[PDB]
Structure formats: structure tokens, C-alpha cells
């Protein structure tokens, strides 16, 4: 198995499940609810396998960060949900602070 | 309703479930896994409520972004150790990002 294939599959499942949950308007449609559960369980299963070959903090940072970008892009196209420039700057400020926290984590004793 | 209390609840459920998952190490992890599943399911419900008011990527970004700071503090030992100066700077960037999302962007039913 290739870990990039698993990590990207985990992200793909995360984006699809989160989009499906938003599309369904919460947990309120049976087939959406079942699909949402399968997507998150698959995403976690792929993550659990992945972290044996990619660092756990790096894998989480890639999984969350790429996921947010793909969810934002897919929401913009599928729902017509446009983001304001301070909101776009705001998520990037969160990413910049998260990078500092990740570096502090990566420089902590092993 | 107020989405920020639900989003904070989702973050709290994420942190508590993660804490239980981290410190259960037994011969079988059955009963702590069951509690972990409940905490993660609660986090997803609370996130699903949040997505009604807050943009899809932005809500996910706050949920991961405030979550990783709490998880990082849990990892390092909370107030059990001397708090780093760049950690404060990283938290300030995350807080600044949240502040412009909160006050220069709208949270309303969509």
C-alpha cells in the first residue's frame, strides 16, 4: 500500500461526508446518514493505517488543511456558497497559527 | 440560535473523546472505545448544527483549529509545564482569524 493514496482517500472521504452532511441539512435523511457514517469511518480507518508511515501531526495537518480547502471549493461550486475576503484571510491566519503550534509540537522531546 | 456554543460543544466533545482515546491502553479497549464513539458522535451532531449558520469550510477550520490547540496543550501537559512565548503568538493568530470571521462575516441560516 502507498500512504499518499490512503491519506488522499481519507481526505476524499472527509470532503464527501462533510458535504453530504451539509447537503442533507444535518442528520435527517436515512441514505445520507448511512453514507455519512461510512465516509467518516473510512476516513478514520485510512488515517489509522497512514500514521504508521507518515508522522501523526503531519498526517492530521494535511488531512484537516486539505479538507478545509476542498470543502470550501466544493461548497462554492455545489451550493453557490461564496466566501468573504476577511473570512478567507481569517482561515489563513488560523493556518499560520496552527503552523506555529505544529512546529512547537515537532520540536518537543520524543 | 447561537452557533458558537454548539461549535464550542463540538470542539469540547472532540477534545474529551480524543483524551479518552489517548489514555486508554489496556488488554482490551472495549468500554473506553464505546465512550470515545459516543463523544465523537456527539461532536459530529454539534458540528452538523453548526453548519446551518456558519460557512462549511470555515466551521470545519475553527473546529480543527481550536481543537488542535487544546489537543497540543493536552499533549504537552496543560499548566503542568512553563508556557512558551511563540505558543501565545500562535494562539493570537488563531484568535485574530476567528475575530475577523466573527465580526466581518455573517452567521445566519443557509
- Residues in chain B within 8 Å Cβ distance of A81: 55-56, 110
d(C-alpha B60, C-alpha A79), whole Å: 16
- Considering CB atoms only, which of A19, A27, A91 is closest to B58? A91
Which chain B residue is nearest to residue A97, measuring alpha carbons?
A: B90
d(C-alpha A8, C-alpha A88), whole Å: 23
Name the packing angle between helices A56-78 and A3-24 (round to 10°).
Answer: 40
d(C-alpha B18, C-alpha A103), whole Å: 21
> What is the nearest CA distance from B37 to chain A, expressed in angstroms?
11
CB within 8 A of B69, min separation 6: which ones?
A101, B90, B91, B94
User: Residue A12 burial by CB count (10 A; 0-12/13-18/19+): exposed, middle or buried?
Assistant: middle
3-state secondary structure chain A: CCHHHHHHHHHHHHHHHHHHHHHHCCCCCHHHHHHHHHHHHHHHHHHHHHCCCCCHHHHHHHHHHHHHHHHHHHHHHHCCCCCCHHHHHHHHHHHHHHHHHHHHHHCCCC
Method: NMR
> What is the nearest CA distance from A46 to chain B, expressed in angstroms?
17
d(C-alpha B51, C-alpha B28), whole Å: 36
- Residues in chain B within 8 Å Cβ distance of A68: 57, 60-61, 64
Task: Determine whether the interchain pair B97/A100 forms a contact, defined as Cβ–Cβ distance below 8 Å.
Answer: no
Q: Is B25 helix (H, G, I), strand (E, B) or coil?
A: coil
Residue B65: which of A98, A87, A106 has the closest Cα?
Answer: A98
CB burial string B20-34: b at 16+ within 10 A, e below: bbeeeeeeeeeebee
Task: Determine whether the interchain pair B49/A26 forms a contact, defined as Cβ–Cβ distance below 8 Å.
Answer: yes
C-alpha A72: how far from chain center: 11
List residues in chain B touching A: CB distance below 8 A. Answer: 44-45, 47-49, 51-52, 55-58, 60-62, 64-65, 68-69, 72, 75-76, 84, 86-87, 89-101, 104-105, 110
Residue-wise DSSP of A74-99 = HHHHHT--PPPHHHHHHHHHHHHHHH
Amino acid at each position: 500500500m502507498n500512504p499518499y493514496i490512503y491519506l488522499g482517500g481519507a481526505i476524499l472521504a472527509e470532503v464527501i461526508g462533510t458535504t453530504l452532511m451539509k447537503f442533507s441539512e444535518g442528520f435527517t435523511r436515512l441514505w445520507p446518514s448511512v453514507g455519512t457514517i461510512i465516509c467518516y469511518c473510512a476516513s478514520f480507518w485510512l488515517l489509522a493505517q497512514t500514521i504508521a508511515y507518515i508522522p501523526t501531526g503531519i498526517a492530521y495537518a494535511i488531512w484537516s488543511g486539505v479538507g478545509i480547502v476542498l470543502i470550501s471549493l466544493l461548497s462554492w461550486g455545489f451550493f453557490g456558497q461564496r466566501l468573504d475576503l476577511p473570512a478567507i484571510i481569517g482561515m489563513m491566519l488560523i493556518c499560520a497559527g496552527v503552523l506555529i503550534i505544529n512546529l512547537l509540537s515537532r520540536s518537543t522531546p520524543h
